[PDB]
Every structure is written in C-alpha cells, then in structure tokens.
Design a protein around this ligand. Structure first.
Ligand code: NAP
Length: 281
C-alpha cells in the first residue's frame, strides 16, 4: 500500500493531485504512440489526474495522444492545454481553443494557459479566456513563464485577478523562483506548476541525488519528485513515454525525505540568495 498523492487547491476551490503528467515531445514518433497513450493511462489509473499539453506539442499530436488516453474516462482527468502567444489575440485565442478541443476530442478543458508572454496586450487574451469560460469551453485560465513583473500586469487587466495558475520552470537545478515568484504565488493562492521537474532528465546524472536515492532504495528521479512534493503550492508534471516509468514516478510519493536529506540538497543545490532572471525552456 503506497502513500497518497498530496492535493493542491486552485483559487476556485477545485483540488488536484500535486503530481501530474507531462506530454511534450509526445506524438512525434509513430512507433512510440501506443506506449505514450499507455503511459498516460497508467498515470491516470494511479491518480496522476492532471495532464499538461499544448497546441504546439507536435502541432496537435500530443493533444490527440491525451484524447486517446482519456477516451472512456474524461471525468477522471484534469486536462490542461495552452495557446501560443502568437495566437493569443482576441479572436486568435478562441480559434486556438477550438482546435485544441477538436484534437482532445472533448467539450471543455479544465485549465487553459497562455504559454508565454507575447506582443498581444494581456487584456485581449484575458478577454478571450473569460468569454471561453462563459461559453463552457474552458473551466479556468492561467499563464506560463510569467515572472513577477508579468504577474503584476494582470492586476491592470480587468478580470486579471482570475488567474488560476502559473506554469514555470522549477526543479533542484533551477530554484530561482524561490526568491520572489513562488512566495508571491503562494501568498496569492495561485498554484505554481513546476515544469521540467527532472530538468529534462539532466538531474538524473547528479551524484548527490543518486546517493540520496541509494539510501532510500529509490531512483534519482523519484528523489527529485519527492523534493517537489515537499513544496507546498506546487504541482509537478514529469513526462515519460514509458508506463514502467509512470509507475516509478507515482511511487516517488512514498519517499519521506529526512530533515538531513533536505539540508544536503540545499547544500548541493543552493537556493537563490538574490533575484534571478526567470529561466525558461
Ligand atoms: N510551459 C512550458 O513552457 C513548458 C516547458 C517545458 C515543459 N513543460 C511541460 O512540462 C513537462 C515535463 O517537463 P519536460 O518534459 O520538459 O522534462 P522532464 O519531465 O523534467 O523530464 C523528461 C525526461 O525524463 C525522462 N524520465 C521521466 N521519468 C523518468 C524516470 N523515472 N526515470 C528516468 N527517466 C525518466 C523522460 O524520458 P522518457 O519519456 O523516454 O521516459 C524524459 O526524457 C513537459 O512534458 C510539458 O508538459 C512546459
């Protein structure tokens, strides 16, 4: 019997498991599709109910993978997608949402993000998000790759205070948001979605993570996710094309990092001591 996935509440009171599933680079290889679908199905069965995708991921292909994986079980998934900033005009956003819904094969996304900051004024994009919400086409909107200054601009936008999430880079190797952005979003009640929680796999070569993994009879990936589980206000979205890895990632929740593991990680992966430029992938 494994331990449960902690839950995080959105501003609107909806709760999701703090461990979800990524999909970037899915749907690029026909030979992997069956496994990618199965990986997401496996994570859903195990309670990794949030799935993060985007219009740009394989230009609709990752969305279609998500659509397969949720076939017969839409109500079990919390589907997140995104609009590219070059599409995030008043009419563009609506048109992009409709494509995503067609690809996903569903009526409504749970959460719809601006993927990063572009040249269209924020009020335009938020206006489109609020109309989609009223139309029953999205349930909530948020943003991604927004630093503090970007977050502040939302207050000048009417309805900008409805922001439901900020999806930014965060893992042991990229702790910059701890200085300012994460504390702001926590004070504000806005979940931070930590993308690339395994630093795209680069963390898995780290000797201190390996050592700590060894002590817990776990894997380095499981340790990287166990750390992020300790962080309140954070939802991590690791991606894997492998159903065996999905199971492994789920079981990262059974690790209880000790006070000494945490000190050692802080020593090996130092927190920012000053404001850091937002890292983006
Ligand atoms: N908003 C944005 O701008 C943005 C940017 C980046 C990412 N994201 C989202 O965040 C998700 C996660 O980040 P990411 O995909 O960039 O990288 P990541 O999840 O940190 O790591 C991905 C890599 O780790 C491997 N992996 C996963 N679990 C493993 C395990 N237990 N053991 C060993 N290797 C493991 C995967 O390989 P296999 O697939 O071969 O197993 C994959 O190559 C993306 O899929 C995407 O949904 C959003």
């Amino acid at each position: 019997m494994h331990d449960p996935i902690p839950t995080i509440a959105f501003p609107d009171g909806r709760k999701v498991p703090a461990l979800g599933q990524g999909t970037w680079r899915m749907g690029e290889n026909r030979a992997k599709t069956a496994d990618e679908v199965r990986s997401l199905q496996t994570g859903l069965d195990l309670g990794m109910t949030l799935i993060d995708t985007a219009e740009m991921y394989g230009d609709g292909a990752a969305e279609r993978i998500v659509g397969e994986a949720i076939k017969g079980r839409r109500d079990e998934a919390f589907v997140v997608s995104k609009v590219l900033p070059s599409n995030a005009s008043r009419a563009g956003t609506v048109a992009a949402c409709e494509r995503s819904l067609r690809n996903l094969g569903i009526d409504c996304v749970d959460l719809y993000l601006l993927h990063w900051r572009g040249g269209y004024p924020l009020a335009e994009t938020v206006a489109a998000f609020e109309e989609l919400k009223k139309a029953g086409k999205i349930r909530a909107w948020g943003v991604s790759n927004f630093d503090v200054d970007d977050m502040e601009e939302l207050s000048a936008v009417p309805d900008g205070g409805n922001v439901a999430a900020n999806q930014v880079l965060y893992n042991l190797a990229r702790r910059g948001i701890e200085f300012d952005l994460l504390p702001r979003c926590r004070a504000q009640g806005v979940p931070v979605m930590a993308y690339s929680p395994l630093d795209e796999g680069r963390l898995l070569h780290d000797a201190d993570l390996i050592h700590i993994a060894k002590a817990h009879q776990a894997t380095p990936a499981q340790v990287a996710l166990a750390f992020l589980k300790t962080c309140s206000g954070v939802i991590s979205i690791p991606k894997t094309g492998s159903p065996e890895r999905a199971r492994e990632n789920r079981d990262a929740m059974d690790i209880h990092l000790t006070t000494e593991n945490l000190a050692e990680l802080d020593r090996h992966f130092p927190p920012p001591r000053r404001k850091t430029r937002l890292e983006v992938i």
